[PDB]
């Protein structure tokens, strides 16, 4: 037991839960919220904008996974859904870049808007509180300066390279009072979007709405949400002599270090080793080190695409899971 996945050169072991009554004759570890409240713990690592890192302790792998899935499934965001085109004489044809508009992040958060109802016909379906409109109009021309030939085509041609900052938000009525303090922008306004030549113009407006990440990958607010498990290294015999420096070069450089008093390797600051399993090849450390992986430590690493703070979606993940599970407590069971 000892909630350690035993890794080796060709397998891993006991990856399952084994945390239920009815597993042995003595039925321990029954369900008790207060005996879980004493044991559950949250460590927060380096936390800042755009990115988060924090630890969760003493949880089964079941509901840890459902947190990872919901953060990139269920929590909605806003992206383009219908791109109304005007005169467009670029070489990038119409539905190519209209696909590229929807994959640009937006800094504005959901809950400021509402869900669009697709049962209504498309004249009142786009209301004043579920749909905001943005547009851009740009025409490349000759820049009449004096460079020489074959130089940079940023001063031969004005606005030849278009960017995400060109997307001018055009407010609709009834909401300019609301978005007065907060104008909406792309999360990264330096994205290249197209290139032009003089005599070519692009004109369009888009309707970005509120949609769920499980429908399409535009609406996923997270870059990528994952979790590791903390590696654990257990040393049987004290390694002495020249083998310890050989034992040091087969790791990431910061995870273990030599004791300077006596010639013996010990464990430095952990959580910096990815499992290179290089110690298994050398057949002289087959008994010195029995390393493993703890089945309850979770290095949650999330980062946003730019929509909101990474701690908020993680708060939003566990909140809507309750609302997911409380919803069907209050509906009857039909035969």
């Amino acid at each position: 037991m000892s909630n350690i996945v035993g890794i080796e050169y060709n397998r891993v072991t006991n990856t399952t839960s084994t945390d239920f009554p009815g597993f042995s004759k003595d039925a321990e570890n029954e369900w008790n919220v207060e005996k879980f409240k004493k044991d559950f713990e949250v460590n927060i690592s380096s936390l800042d904008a755009r990115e988060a890192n924090f630890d969760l302790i003493n949880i089964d792998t079941s509901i840890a996974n459902a947190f990872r899935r919901i953060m990139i499934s269920e929590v909605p965001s806003v992206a383009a859904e219908y791109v109304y085109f005007f005169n467009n004489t670029s070489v990038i044809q119409d539905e190519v870049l209209a696909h590229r508009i929807g994959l640009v992040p937006l800094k504005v958060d959901p809950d400021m808007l509402t869900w669009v109802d697709s049962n209504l016909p498309d004249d009142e379906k786009f209301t004043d509180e579920n749909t905001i409109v943005l547009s851009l109009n740009v025409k490349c021309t000759r820049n009449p300066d004096a460079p020489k030939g074959s130089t940079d085509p940023k001063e031969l041609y004005n606005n030849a390279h278009v960017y995400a900052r060109d997307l001018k938000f055009e407010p609709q009525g009834r909401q300019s009072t609301t978005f007065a303090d907060c104008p909406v922008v792309p999360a990264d306004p330096d994205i290249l979007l197209a290139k032009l030549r003089p005599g070519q113009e692009i004109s369009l407006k888009a309707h970005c709405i509120l949609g769920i990440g499980g429908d399409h990958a535009k609406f996923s607010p997270v870059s990528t949400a994952s979790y590791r498990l903390l590696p654990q290294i257990n040393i049987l015999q004290p390694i002495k002599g020249e083998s310890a420096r050989r034992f040091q070069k087969c790791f990431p450089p910061g995870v273990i270090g030599i004791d300077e008093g006596s010639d013996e390797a010990y464990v430095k600051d952990a959580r910096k080793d990815t499992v290179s399993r290089e110690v298994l090849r050398y057949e002289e450390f087959a008994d010195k080190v029995k390393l493993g992986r703890v089945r309850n430590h979770f290095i949650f690493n999330v980062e946003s695409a730019g929509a909101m703070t990474p701690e908020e979606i993680f708060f939003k993940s566990v909140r809507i899971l309750k609302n997911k599970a409380e919803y069907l407590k209050n509906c009857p069971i039909t035969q």
């Binding site: 070489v91 190519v96 696909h99 994959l103 399409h216 990958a217 535009k218 996923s220």
Partner: protein
């Protein structure tokens, strides 16, 4: 088996491909040069306009939907634009003068 299929690979065609009018001509939207090249392919400048792109494979069985050499891929990468091909097709007609 590959040299009979290599002629059927989709990618770029030529630099003037947005100008020529040919019968039934496909394109790939986002092409990429391959990771492991060859001394052969840099002599014909295959890398200057490649065909096909390199994705991240995880060779394994999964969900039983790949039994013998089937493939399994994710909805997100297509939604990010994993190889969106494009079909261009000519059609023609001739105004014709009669004897009267």
């Amino acid at each position: 088996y590959q040299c009979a299929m290599g002629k059927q690979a989709i990618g770029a065609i030529a630099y003037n491909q947005f100008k020529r009018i040919d019968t039934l001509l496909y394109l790939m939207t986002y092409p990429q040069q391959p990771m492991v090249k060859t001394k052969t392919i840099e002599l014909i400048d295959y890398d200057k306009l490649p065909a096909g792109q390199n994705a991240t494979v995880a060779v394994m069985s999964y969900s039983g939907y790949d039994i013998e050499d089937a493939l399994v891929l994710n909805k997100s990468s297509i939604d990010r634009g994993f190889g969106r091909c494009e079909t261009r097709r000519k059609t023609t007609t001739v105004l014709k003068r009669y004897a009267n």
